Design a protein around this ligand. Structure first.
Ligand SMILES: Cn1cncc1[C@@](N)(c1ccc(Cl)cc1)c1ccc2c(c1)c(-c1cccc(Cl)c1)cc(=O)n2C
Ligand SMILES: [Zn+2]
Lengths: 315, 397
């Protein structure tokens, strides 16, 4: 039970425990392509893994061999497979194996294969008692870690552990209101716990989202959120919005406000409103301030909007 | 002169509203660095100065295709990609593949191919759909009947069926999990080979659409933040399945387009996150798709001369901030060369220089006219010619 990294490490070739088994080299063929010049430590391990694998040796010695193969290339799904195999036949204590996996994730928070394993374990034992603390620790190093969030929504849905999630959400939103992943996690906890159809909740969110805009006006998160939970029933269906935004207009402007208003006008026209032509201009006017000045990088797009509107609300 | 260098562009830097957060601090470091970049090319500019290093990028590819250092050892179980990225990057850059190299390559993928369908990360590894989309893609790049016959279409189709789920989603691999990408893989693969039974993708058009959220984009699995790698896979997968409309295509376009960075010029992968090397294909690479759809529906307001993203600015990025002198292309300045971005920056550039919808065909080539890259199909990201050769071939079985 050594370690791939101990200064006292020894190849499997120069080992006694592994004397009885012939390693199996790779087969890149007679004339190899995109072939890797594996080191000698790396190559060793796998020649001895293929071996175990090739003979389907469900042995307690190989079980640990897989731990070194994993560490040398944790993106190797085949080895990860052969480990779950050994875990179940060898019948290894899966909680000791949870401590293992907690460790690799802390070491490579960005592997897609190292989280699936932890998903396998957790459902193998029906125990989410940890997880959330874990997931919080990982996201405490990188709060926009895709896999963590994914594995966290899983643990929450699968074990109905909502409760304190919108709570965690609010926390992270303070730590960095620009964390676009937390504005997602937030919509995840809400649309599945109380939905937004509820007039009070949709109202609670919009005020927060609004008082959050006013705080950091150029944060594009608090905007996509106030634009996506409302564009549901129809951005046009909420009058009072189109004004207030025109109020924040001076000391809170940004093409994120000017863009928003365009979005509003577009839907209004879509729900056959009044001052038709008048609005149809309040839009094409804003399409230009943007396409030509406040948001040039997106010019080719703010022109499509312009032409799209004219071709469909003026004739 | 150049968009990225016009004086007014200094007006496109981040405004943290005097409220510093981690995201703000991190995006600040990036804009500032990318500023020096645009700024060094502000002490000179004598003859055509934005050049794509064809040759430097060529040794890089040319060599890695035959042998890689001990560095790319973690790609140990993902070699088919190494075959794809390189053959597609050589393709774009316009370098023929020695008819010898091809057979050698056809021989490799051959060894990965599972006796039950699909391809593994390398010789003697279980079948998975990532390397399978790579193999088939790499073999279709080669387009010789030698390449085409490598694929065991029957076992390919049985395998795909073994990953199928009741809700119309595909497992990434046997025992593995499912994200949008796995769908784009099964379709892209089952498409070119012409092995689509009538019930193979049932419910997938549906499951894919279920991944589009409040941002307008698409995430890996329902409820995930919007992401460009996946957003591409979602649409392109649907475009193949002919269901682009199954999506709220408008909130999508609005999401993609907003992802391009007003200062940097390139695309970011998620709202409020750093600009990045690829995403010049995973993101910008979407506009070609949305066009076909928006136009397939009629919509008369689609430009006839340009994609709906700033092409000038994207090219000005890839060419001025992602090329390593040594060769290959980068994430963002000072992030290390790798065959992955080396491919998706050349694919995105190509996408940013090539426009066409119907009879119209208008190209924009920032830099020197020698930077004109080879066209690339927006769905399979392989030469639009090779796509034809592939199907036209397999559509006879
Ligand atoms: C998330 N991401 C964004 N830019 C790069 C990365 C990535 N974290 C990554 C992880 C998983 C997947 Cl499916 C795709 C991309 C990343 C980062 C660096 C990488 C590679 C990948 C990859 C790689 C390896 C296999 C598949 C793909 Cl698509 C990419 C190769 C490589 O040499 N380097 C240096
Ligand atoms: Zn990248």
């Amino acid at each position: 039970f050594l370690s791939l990294d101990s200064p006292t490490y020894v190849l499997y070739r120069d080992r006694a425990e592994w004397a009885d088994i012939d390693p199996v080299p790779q087969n890149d063929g007679p004339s190899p392509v995109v072939q890797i010049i594996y080191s000698e430590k790396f190559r060793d391990v796998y020649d001895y893994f293929r071996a175990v694998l090739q003979r389907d040796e469900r042995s307690e010695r190989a079980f640990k061999l897989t731990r070194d193969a994993i560490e040398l290339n944790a993106a190797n799904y085949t080895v990860w497979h052969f480990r779950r195999v050994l875990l179940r036949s060898l019948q290894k204590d899966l909680q000791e194996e949870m401590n293992y996996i907690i460790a690799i994730i802390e070491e490579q928070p960005k592997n897609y294969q190292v989280w699936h394993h932890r998903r396998v374990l957790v459902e193998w034992l029906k125990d989410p008692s940890q997880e959330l603390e874990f997931i919080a620790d990982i996201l405490n190093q990188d709060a926009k870690n895709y896999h963590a969030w994914q594995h966290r929504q899983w643990v929450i849905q699968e074990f109905r552990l909502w409760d304190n999630e919108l709570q965690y959400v609010d926390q992270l939103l303070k730590e960095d209101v620009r964390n676009n992943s937390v504005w997602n996690q937030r919509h995840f906890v809400i649309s599945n716990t109380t939905g937004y159809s509820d007039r009070a909740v949709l109202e609670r969110e919009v005020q927060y989202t609004l008082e959050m805009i006013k705080l950091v006006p150029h944060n594009e998160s608090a905007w996509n959120y106030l634009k996506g939970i409302l564009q549901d029933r129809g951005l046009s269906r909420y009058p009072n919005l189109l004004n207030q935004l025109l109020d924040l207009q001076p000391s809170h402007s940004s093409p994120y406000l000017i863009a928003f208003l365009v979005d509003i006008y577009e839907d209004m026209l879509e729900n056959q409103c009044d001052n038709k032509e008048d609005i149809l201009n309040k839009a094409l006017e804003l399409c230009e301030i943007l396409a030509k000045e406040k948001d040039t990088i997106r010019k080719e797009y703010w022109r499509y909007i312009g032409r799209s509107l004219q071709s469909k609300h003026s004739r | 002169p150049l968009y990225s260098l016009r004086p007014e562009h200094a007006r496109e830097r981040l405004q943290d509203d005097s409220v510093e957060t981690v995201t703000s601090i991190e995006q600040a470091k990036v804009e500032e660095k990318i500023q020096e970049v645009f700024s060094s090319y502000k002490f000179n500019h004598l003859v055509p100065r934005l050049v794509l290093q064809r040759e430097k990028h060529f040794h890089y590819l040319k060599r890695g295709l035959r042998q890689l250092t001990d560095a790319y050892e973690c790609l140990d179980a993902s070699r088919p990609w190494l075959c794809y990225w390189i053959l597609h990057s050589l393709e774009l850059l316009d370098e023929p593949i020695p008819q010898i190299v091809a057979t050698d390559v056809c021989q490799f993928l051959e060894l990965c191919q599972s006796p039950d369908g699909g391809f593994g990360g390398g010789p003697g590894q279980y079948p998975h759909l990532a390397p399978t989309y790579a193999a088939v893609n790499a073999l279709c790049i080669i387009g010789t009947e030698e390449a085409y016959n490598v694929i065991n279409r029957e076992k390919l189709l049985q395998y795909l069926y073994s990953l199928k789920q009741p809700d119309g989603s595909f497992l990434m691999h046997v025992g593995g999990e499912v994200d949008v990408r796995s769908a784009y893989c099964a379709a892209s693969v089952a498409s070119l080979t012409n092995i689509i039974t009538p019930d193979l993708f049932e419910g997938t058009a549906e499951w894919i659409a279920r991944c589009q959220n409040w941002e307008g984009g698409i995430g890996g699995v329902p409820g995930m933040e919007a992401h460009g790698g996946y957003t591409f896979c979602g649409l392109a997968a649907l475009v193949i399945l002919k269901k682009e409309r199954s999506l709220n295509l408008k909130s999508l376009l609005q999401w993609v387009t907003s992802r391009q960075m007003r200062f940097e010029g390139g695309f970011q992968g998620r709202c409020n996150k750093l600009v990045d090397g690829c995403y010049s294909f995973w993101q910008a690479g979407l506009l070609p798709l949305l066009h076909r759809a928006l136009h397939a529906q009629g919509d008369p307001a689609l430009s006839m001369s340009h994609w709906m993203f700033h092409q000038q600015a994207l090219q000005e990025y890839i060419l001025m901030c992602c090329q390593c002198p040594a060769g290959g292309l980068l994430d963002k300045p000072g992030k290390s060369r790798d065959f992955y971005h080396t491919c998706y920056c050349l694919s995105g550039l190509s996408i940013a220089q090539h426009f066409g919808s119907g009879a119209m065909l208008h190209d924009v080539v920032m830099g020197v006219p020698e930077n004109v890259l080879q066209p690339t199909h927006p769905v399979y990201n392989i030469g639009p010619d090779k796509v034809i050769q592939a199907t036209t071939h397999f559509l006879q079985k």
